[PDB]
Amino acid sequence: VKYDATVRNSINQVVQLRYGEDGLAGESVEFQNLATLKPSNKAFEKKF
Amino acid sequence: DDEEETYRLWKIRKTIMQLCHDRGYLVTQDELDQTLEEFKAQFGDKPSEGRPRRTDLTVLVAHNDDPTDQMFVFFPEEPKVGIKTIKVYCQRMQEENITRALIVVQQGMTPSAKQSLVDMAPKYILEQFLQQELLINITEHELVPEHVVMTKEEVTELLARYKLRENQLPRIQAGDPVARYFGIKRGQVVKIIRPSETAGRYITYRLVQ
Amino acid sequence: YMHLPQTDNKKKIIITEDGEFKALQEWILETDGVSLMRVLSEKDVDPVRTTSNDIVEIFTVLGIEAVRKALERELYHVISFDGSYVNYRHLALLCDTMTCRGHLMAITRHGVNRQDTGPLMKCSFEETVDVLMEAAAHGESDPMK
Amino acid sequence: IFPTGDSKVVLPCNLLRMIWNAQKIFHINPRLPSDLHPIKVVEGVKELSKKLVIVNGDDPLSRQAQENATLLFNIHLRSTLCSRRMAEEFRLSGEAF
Amino acid sequence: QANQKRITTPYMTKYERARVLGTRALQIAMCAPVMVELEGETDPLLIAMKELKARKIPIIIRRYLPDGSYEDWGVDELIISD
């Protein structure tokens, strides 16, 4: 990763615009639940 | 038989209209959405010596930005398309003073005919498509993400923004089925919008070579 | 082969009128060998969700981006089969960097050495004498980066 | 974006644990009513989302790139920080927010 | 470049953290001036930590963008991650 936060090869070939498509390193990521995809339309409207 | 040939022609025509619309052309919505019965009633019924003759299925359509490109798809009838067919196609290509045209081969095309297409198209751009290629619209496949062709000024804006060079960008083969489907000359850049399970959406740039 | 799937990966999933996902079982067909193009062309075959395990076939049919997505999915499948999990970042990097050059990069002497990368790093990994012979013959210059 | 109903996804900050930490650090009593204007939450989350930048810039292309990069975190954040959810489930106070 | 247009992450990261701490510790180990008052410390590393916490590093970091242009940052405008 160069300091433009663009992953690049040895000869400066852009492999990824941002690391992992988001620019977030792997040591500070956790598992979470979206809690919005699964609930139905009625439940979604009731809860939001 | 006649029914299977009708189904194949219907799918080919629908995919051709889809390709024209994606490339950007004056394709009417009704023309894009044609049912099998509509195809039967509109360009004749049974093929194989019926009204469908593989010559009246040619399509003329103009470009959105300027109605002068007038891309014009062909439909050769022979199983193999032999130089004299390309010659008469070129006569018609010049006579109707258009620039872009496509060819839908049934089975295959000769090495000499490929040679003629590639060398004899600095002014008359022509493209190849095998018949089975058009039975499925590759864009609608789940794996293939959405593709968008980038204009030159947008490419310059991108290069200025990221301070890259043309060589440094990722590359995509000119013979890739998607590139052929979009009909894009070397040196252009295609924007790719794919889904990702870590960012929600990713913009990726491929430079055809 | 004919069999109703049980794992939700291959099961039909759609949005209901109520908005809730419903696990719908639909027949699926798994075939030995690959004829992906004609299989898609065939009647009553979904052109959307059909896929394959072969890489060169899907490359020649769909395109390089399809190679990216399918290869990422398949690598995730093979790594995750035994229950061990790995982050998406590394799989994404590997699949991109194989697909960054517009053709199927094989991670072998036959793929790595055929890049514009410098001769020194090429010789460190296999063909370790032929690379320098080629560089000397062509007078290739290494940027040292 | 997400077929198959795979609600498990990897994001940087564990929002639920953060809210729980706020609750049990400021001794917020869920029974009593809170003092947290929903608009305060609205512009709070909006201003936060503005201050999280992956693609730093102001031109339209950079802005679109930043939106695409931070879409999943922003959408999860808005889902977890919704006005009704904060009012009912979490019951945080202004300093807690 | 000038003071304006300065675009880069203002978070002085762990790599430059390690480099600056090491170099400043080496400099003090070679009898270099101390930037902050010290109360009975002798290890170069510990005093380097304390004076970094005091935010008085006499070093400016030069950052190489991929294009080639540099971008200089002083330590005292940078805010510590901790």
Mapping DSSP onto H, E and C, the string for chain C reads CEECCCCCCCCEEEECCCCCEEEECCCEECCCCCCHHHHHHCCCCCCCCCCCCCHHHHHHHCCHHHHHHHHHHHHHHHHHCCCCCCCHHHHHHHHHHHHCCCCCCCCCHHHHCCCCCCHHHHHHCCCCCHHHHHHHHHCCCCCCC
> In whole angstroms, how far apart are CA D96 and each of D41, D86, D92?
11, 11, 6
- Which of D82, D73, D74 has its CA nearest to residue D19? D82
User: What gap in Å lies between CA D62 and CA D57, rounded to an integer?
Assistant: 6
Would you give the distance in Å from CA A44 to the centre of its chain? 24
Using an 8 Å CB-CB cutoff, list chain B residues near E8.
none
The DSSP letter of residue D53 is -
User: What gap in Å lies between CA B172 and CA C100, rounded to an integer?
Assistant: 8
**C-alpha neighbours within 13 Å on the C-beta side of residue C71:** 25
Range of the domain at E13: 1-82
Which of C48, C60, C70 shows the shortest C-beta gap to B140?
A: C48
Using an 8 Å CB-CB cutoff, list chain D residues near E8.
56
Cβ proximity of E57 and E77 under 8 Å: no
Tokens of A26: 């792997």
E-strand stretches of E14-68? 60-64
| Chains with 3 or more CB pairs under 8 A to chain C | A, B, D
Helix (H, G, I), strand (E, B) or coil at B205: strand
User: What gap in Å lies between CA B204 and CA C93, rounded to an integer?
Assistant: 13
- Residue B101 bridge partners (DSSP): B72, B126
**Rounded (10°) angle between helices B111-119 and B84-95:** 20
Cβ proximity of B128 and B171 under 8 Å: no
B8 contacts: CB under 8 Å, gap ≥ 6:
B131, B135
Q: Could A4 and E9 be called an inter-chain contact, meaning their C-beta atoms sit closer than 8 Å?
A: no
User: What gap in Å lies between CA B135 and CA B106, rounded to an integer?
Assistant: 12
User: What gap in Å lies between CA D59 and CA A44, rounded to an integer?
Assistant: 35
CA torsion, ordered C7, C12, C16, C20, to nearest 10 deg: 20
User: What gap in Å lies between CA B72 and CA B77, rounded to an integer?
Assistant: 16
Which of B157, B200, B202 shows the shortest C-beta gap to D61?
A: B157
User: What gap in Å lies between CA B103 and CA B110, rounded to an integer?
Assistant: 13
> Chain D: residue nearest C20 by CA?
D5
User: What gap in Å lies between CA C12 and CA C7, rounded to an integer?
Assistant: 10
In which residue are the tokens 């029914």 written?
B3
D28 burial via Cβ count (<10 Å: 0-12, 13-18, 19+): middle
Tokens of D86: 């904060």
CATH code for B1-136?
3.40.1340.10
- Helix, strand, coil tally for chain E in percent (to 5): 35, 15, 50
Domain parsing of chain B, residue ranges: 1-136, 137-209
Give the strand pairing for B100-105 and B71-73. Answer: parallel
User: What gap in Å lies between CA B137 and CA B132, rounded to an integer?
Assistant: 11
> In whole angstroms, how far apart are CA C38 and each of B132, B180, C42, C43, C64?
8, 19, 6, 10, 19
Which of D10, D69, D82 shows the shortest C-beta gap to A29?
A: D10
Cβ proximity of B36 and B10 under 8 Å: yes
Find which of A4, A27, A29, A33 to mutate to test the D interface (most D CBs within 10 Å of its CB): A33
Q: Could A21 and B198 be called an inter-chain contact, meaning their C-beta atoms sit closer than 8 Å?
A: yes
User: What gap in Å lies between CA B104 and CA B79, rounded to an integer?
Assistant: 11
Would you tell me how many other CB atoms lie within 10 Å of the CB of residue D30? 11
User: What gap in Å lies between CA E53 and CA E51, rounded to an integer?
Assistant: 5
User: What gap in Å lies between CA B43 and CA B52, rounded to an integer?
Assistant: 7
- Residue A32 bridge partners (DSSP): D9
In which residue are the tokens 């790719």 written?
B192
Experimental structure resolution, Å: 3.4
> In whole angstroms, how far apart are CA E50 and each of B28, E34, E41, E42, E53?
73, 11, 10, 12, 5
- Which of B203, A8, D53, D69 has its CA nearest to residue E7? D53
Domain containing E77 — which CATH number?
Answer: 3.90.940.10
User: What gap in Å lies between CA E38 and CA B117, rounded to an integer?
Assistant: 82
Q: Could C13 and D10 be called an inter-chain contact, meaning their C-beta atoms sit closer than 8 Å?
A: no
User: What gap in Å lies between CA B76 and CA B113, rounded to an integer?
Assistant: 13
Domain count of chain E? 1
Cβ proximity of C68 and C37 under 8 Å: no
**C-alpha neighbours within 13 Å on the C-beta side of residue B72:** 20
Cβ proximity of C14 and C25 under 8 Å: no
E15 touches chain A (CB under 8 A): no
Q: Which CATH class is domain B137-209?
A: alpha beta
The DSSP letter of residue E40 is S
